[PDB]
């Protein structure tokens, strides 16, 4: 057997790990399948994509087109249905009708062998007709055959009868395909909508307490849920909810030794009170947690628990499973580190003495929280644990519960970041917070919306407890507005960490990305009521963004994104589409100075003629404009961070 | 089982068709094997390449290095031995020694945990020592262990004893490797030197006749062999040597109807006299051909026969195997075409009615010429025959005779050109003739010497019977000198078609690449003796180029090539290396005007310091220069096309 088939179909994409790992989609997501298709000689080829579902049932007729002239690269758009494991094949084939028509249009006017050319056409159309199930379509083709063969008629007349619009339509739907050749199938894993699309809100339940009991409980924390739901969010991500170690506990502002009342860092998991399958006693009981998860669900909120596979020194695993840790010659365990950061309060896991025990217990823990309604895990620093470990755990969990979503917090180099997504992480944290200029944002989102979208789903958190970017520190509120618009419009999954809305932007010190008085190390009560009444929260903007997302399908996808040029380096413009919905965004990335610019829309890239002028609505203000090829904008920081416009129907 | 192993080793290159087709080399050729290697956490990785021969025997220790910082991309150079099918794997591993040294150099001066760190080092070195086969090496490592453990000595002293040059050498050769992880093996087809390296000369034996018998024979044609051997060539490529059709035979200058004496085109193969397994009666007998091949071999010349799988209308196959042709409804066979060119004299083969008969006969024909000493086939327009057909034929022939070299004359689009090489063609014709500017030559050769070199071996013919480029037409002799230098120095395989040496450059007309009075359609006698005495041949330059190639290993390889900048767009500079041989070439691409320029050598890329000034010899003149970072050159067309310099050891 040969490696190339009769009609070459080569390098089918998307492909992940040479076919050893599946490409990704979610339900209702469209993406391009592509291949290099051609044949020997000078005749025309055709190609089509065959998408097969988990039952192996083929999709609709999906013809491909050459994507650029001379390139022999073909593509078609396909759309994922129900969740599960699918496959896709490209079929390539001789297109003798297109070939014949090409010669016929040339020879018949030149009067070359007209009877022979016309008879040749008749026999192709007869073969094409024999495959057509429709009776009207069959008769339409046979009718042309007869006219092709009517030797009493002028040549160019007989030919014209084979080139009519209705003949074209029949053939476009049921083409005569020569020498049909198929690629080997490639895998597609289709997961639920939330893996790609959703708004995330992170908060610390302990911070939402009372004057009498400052340490919040699940029952007091649950009072925050209506506000979070009302801001249009779908997921609440909680930092670790287990007991917290006392040994080497950190105090306020990441000080080394905690004093009497210091609450420590939730990530320092474990004490005599319990480990990863337990609730911090001050947060309440597992019953109180069930209440929190129930009350969340009623507001349309899914809970995402933090999974940090690491231990305080007081975690029971330290004595129960010592071989889960690396011990130095004096018996001690070196605390975890992400240099120059030290985590004195935290021991890292060692995976090579008992990989099976670690995997077994990890999946037990996860299934415990799953049995209490947690269907999303935010995995803490996964890149300090083995890659194959995550592959095994994820495959084990999704094997029984394929709805479970894992989010990889891997702020690391691209290789590890890529590979983590490729081995099964449904979502990835990204370089977003460090992409702030027009060039940075344009380069990075081009990358994320390109080939990487076949394996990675990005979660654009505008801030985290560990990341307060300089842009925000120096920018103030108009900077918080800008980043919110960007996150919410550039990725179908975005998020904020509580405090962002109040524009908390005081760092630990100049040149740090740590917050001052970080909530990681202390209870951090907020006067949410006062902020609202005084308008010192960008909560309404956030709410408006999530509403716009919920009303505009273009914003619930990743791959369709185009950047439109402007005459200002501070001003960035881009558009996203999904079916007939088109959103167009212009942002002033300067948080201190008004910027006026001329936005030059790639009209064809919106599906419009160059001269066309179609109306838009700015969804932030409800104000209408008529835009076209070249448009003036004037964006004043504080008044208008950006224009988030829909093209009107 | 997981797809990623304990230490991620991913995307091993070179790879061809995802591992379904082999990467290529020849005996003695070096190339880079690369992979993406990394691990979880912050500790060091190492990697190495394991090359295995046809018996499965491993090669020498081949440690890899990260190729660019932060990239996680590793590579090493490997070298092919004997011909056959080899395989290569990349091994990745934790490098705990490099990790430990890093921490030890920091902690020990800072006085952090010095006894613990030193004991940790001692235990790694003990494990490292236990793997070392050498006794002196083992003792060298145990010596360091003892020192590391000598608690009566200063900490930084104990450390230093483990960081000595001889300890390094032992560890570099026998590193302590943690958690060794291997990629799946990839295939390497190693073929003979001539598949990559060789000088080719094309001529028509019929043109070398006598005053009495103008139509040359193999016995008269053999008189040209000494002169071709003396020009330094290794291969003689003959156009088709079979009988030629009479029906629709072409006359002189590609006229439609041949008259009484017209000899026709060799590619119009077949008559009642014989087909592809026969000799044209005017060329002589199969015995006369054996004589030609014998006389060639004695001069160090291999014969490359044209294989053109196509027929004149008078070929026996036309009546013996009608199903090998497509017949129109009136029974006629459409003549072959490469539009706008028509080949009225030639019928194309149809492959879909009897693929097995065609394949069987093709390999029979090839084996017939092989039994007569032909071990190289120049395959005419392979891209108009099925890709899979060539794959099957090549795999069939190399299955029994792996020395047989196929050269693909595929002047087509890149997908087909690439695929042809990938399915087994040892050599490819290229776009060379259409790369004439510095940007064109630089872009194209960057491409050919890069990833394509894992599957394609280029044959740079400066001209062909079907290609007289405008550069040569308008350039005259100095243009012939330029293109000869470029071909001979940029590819390890190059060639010319007889007449090039005499600077024959009259086209059929303006804007044509056909020669006037093309030898394809007529006998074309040349006064070779007169040209030599009158100095109107560039034969001595050509001879000098092949001598330079034969004396400089750098010129017998492809992949090592670097382009050095110049301040003149007309002036191009590049360098090639192999072991300690370095050849440096500067060319004036302007065939009408003298060009002076400053050549700015990438000194490190030659393996030299920036300030260094190392001497050269221009092998075309024997003149010596001292070159360095910045060098003035002055190149006068007619006097000096180029500088072809060797760096003196």
UniProtKB/Swiss-Prot annotation, chains A, B:
Alphabetical UniProt keywords: Carbohydrate metabolism, Glycosyltransferase, Transferase
Entry GO MF terms: alpha-amylase activity; hexosyltransferase activity
Group of enzyme by EC: transferase
InterPro entries: GlgE, GLGE_C, GlgE_dom_N/S, Glyco_hydro_13_cat_dom, Glyco_hydro_b, Glycoside_hydrolase_SF, Ig-like_fold
Regulation: Is competitively inhibited by alpha-, beta- and gamma-cyclodextrins (cyclic maltooligosaccharides), unlike GlgE from M.tuberculosis.
Catalytic reaction equation(s): alpha-maltose 1-phosphate + [(1->4)-alpha-D-glucosyl](n) = [(1->4)-alpha-D-glucosyl](n+2) + phosphate
Enzyme Commission code(s) on record: 2.4.99.16
Site (Transition state stabilizer): 466
Domain of life according to the entry: Bacteria
Temperature and activity: Optimum temperature is 30 degrees Celsius with maltohexaose as acceptor substrate.
Active site: 380, 409
KW Transferase (keyword) present: yes
Binding site for alpha-maltose 1-phosphate: 250, 310, 345, 381, 520-521
Statement: the UniProt record of this protein carries the keyword Chloroplast: no
GO biological process: alpha-glucan biosynthetic process; oligosaccharide catabolic process
pH dependence: Optimum pH is 7.0 with maltohexaose as acceptor substrate.
Cited HAMAP family: GlgE
Family to which the UniProt record says this protein belongs: Belongs to the glycosyl hydrolase 13 family. GlgE subfamily.
Complexes and interactors: Homodimer.
Function per UniProt: Maltosyltransferase that uses maltose 1-phosphate (M1P) as the sugar donor to elongate linear or branched alpha-(1->4)-glucans. Maltooligosaccharides with a degree of polymerization (DP) superior or equal to 4 are efficient acceptors, with DP6 being optimal in the GlgE-catalyzed polymerization with M1P. Is specific for the alpha-anomer of M1P as substrate, since the beta-anomer of M1P gives no activity. Alpha-D-glucose 1-phosphate cannot serve as a donor substrate, but alpha-maltosyl fluoride is an efficient donor in vitro.
Record-given protein name: Alpha-1,4-glucan:maltose-1-phosphate maltosyltransferase 1
């Amino acid at each position: 057997p040969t490696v190339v088939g009769r009609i070459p179909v080569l390098d089918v994409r998307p492909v992940v790990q040479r076919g050893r790992r599946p490409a990704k989609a979610v339900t209702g997501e469209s993406f391009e399948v592509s291949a290099t298709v051609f044949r020997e000689g000078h005749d025309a080829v055709g190609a089509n994509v065959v998408l097969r579902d988990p039952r192996g049932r083929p999709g609709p007729w999906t013809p491909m087109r050459e994507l650029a002239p001379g390139t022999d690269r073909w593509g078609a758009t396909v759309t994922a249905g129900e969740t599960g494991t699918w496959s896709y094949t490209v079929e390539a084939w001789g297109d003798p009708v297109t070939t014949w028509r090409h010669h016929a249009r040339i020879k018949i006017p030149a009067g070359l062998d007209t009877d022979l050319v016309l008879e040749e056409g008749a026999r192709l159309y007869e073969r094409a007709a024999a495959d057509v199930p429709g009776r009207e379509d069959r008769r339409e083709l046979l009718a042309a055959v007869d006219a092709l063969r009517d030797e009493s008629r002028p040549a160019a007349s007989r030919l014209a009868a084979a080139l009519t619009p209705q003949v074209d339509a029949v053939l476009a739907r049921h083409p005569l395909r020569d020498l049909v050749t198929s690629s080997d199938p490639l895998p597609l894993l289709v997961e639920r909508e939330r893996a790609l699309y959703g708004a995330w809100y992170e908060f610390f339940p302990r911070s939402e307490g009372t004057p009498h009991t400052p340490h919040g409980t699940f029952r007091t924390a649950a009072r925050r849920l209506p506000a979070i739901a009302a801001m249009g969010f779908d997921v609440v991500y909680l930092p670790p909810i287990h007991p917290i170690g006392t040994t080497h506990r950190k105090g306020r502002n990441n000080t080394l030794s905690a004093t009497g009342d210091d609450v420590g860092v939730p990530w320092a998991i474990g004490s005599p009170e319990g480990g990863h399958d337990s609730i911090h006693p001050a947060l309440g009981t597992l019953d109180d947690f069930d209440h929190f998860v129930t009350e969340a669900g009623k507001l349309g909120l899914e809970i995402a628990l933090d999974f940090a596979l690491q231990c305080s020194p007081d975690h029971p695993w330290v004595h129960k499973h010592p071989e889960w840790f690396h011990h130095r010659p004096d018996g001690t365990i070196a605390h975890a580190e992400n240099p120059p950061k030290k985590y004195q309060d935290i021991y890292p896991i060692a995976f090579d003495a008992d990989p099976d025990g670690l995997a077994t217990e990890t999946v037990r823990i996860l299934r415990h929280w799953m049995d209490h309604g947690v269907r999303i895990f935010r995995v803490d620093n996964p890149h300090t644990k083995p890659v194959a470990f995550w592959e095994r755990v994820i495959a084990d969990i999704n094997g029984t519960d394929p709805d479970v979503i894992f989010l990889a917090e891997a702020f690391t180099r691209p290789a590890m970041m890529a590979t983590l997504a490729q081995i099964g992480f449904q979502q990835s944290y990204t370089y977003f917070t460090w992409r702030n200029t027009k060039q940075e944002l344009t380069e990075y989102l081009t990358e994320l919306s390109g080939e990487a979208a076949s394996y990675m789903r990005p979660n654009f958190f505008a801030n985290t407890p560990d990341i307060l970017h300089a842009y925000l520190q120096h920018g103030g509120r108009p900077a918080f507005e800008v980043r919110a618009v960007l996150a919410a419009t550039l990725s179908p999954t975005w998020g904020i960490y509580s405090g962002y809305e109040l524009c908390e932007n005081t760092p630990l010190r100049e040149g740090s990305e740590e917050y001052l008085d970080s909530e990681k190390y202390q209870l951090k009560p907020r006067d949410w009521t006062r902020a609202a009444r005084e308008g010192t929260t960008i909560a309404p903007l956030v709410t408006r963004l999530n509403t716009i997302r919920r009303e505009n399908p273009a914003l619930r996808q990743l791959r369709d994104l185009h950047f439109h040029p402007t005459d200002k380096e501070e001003v960035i413009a881009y558009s996203k589409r999904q079916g007939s919905n088109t959103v167009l965004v212009v942002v002033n990335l300067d948080p201190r100075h008004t910027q006026e610019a001329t936005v030059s829309l790639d009209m064809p890239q919106l599906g419009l003629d160059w001269h066309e002028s179609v109306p838009v609505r700015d969804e932030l203000t409800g104000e209408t404009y008529h835009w076209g090829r070249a448009n003036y904008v004037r964006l004043e920081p504080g008044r208008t961070p950006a224009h988030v416009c829909t093209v009107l129907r």
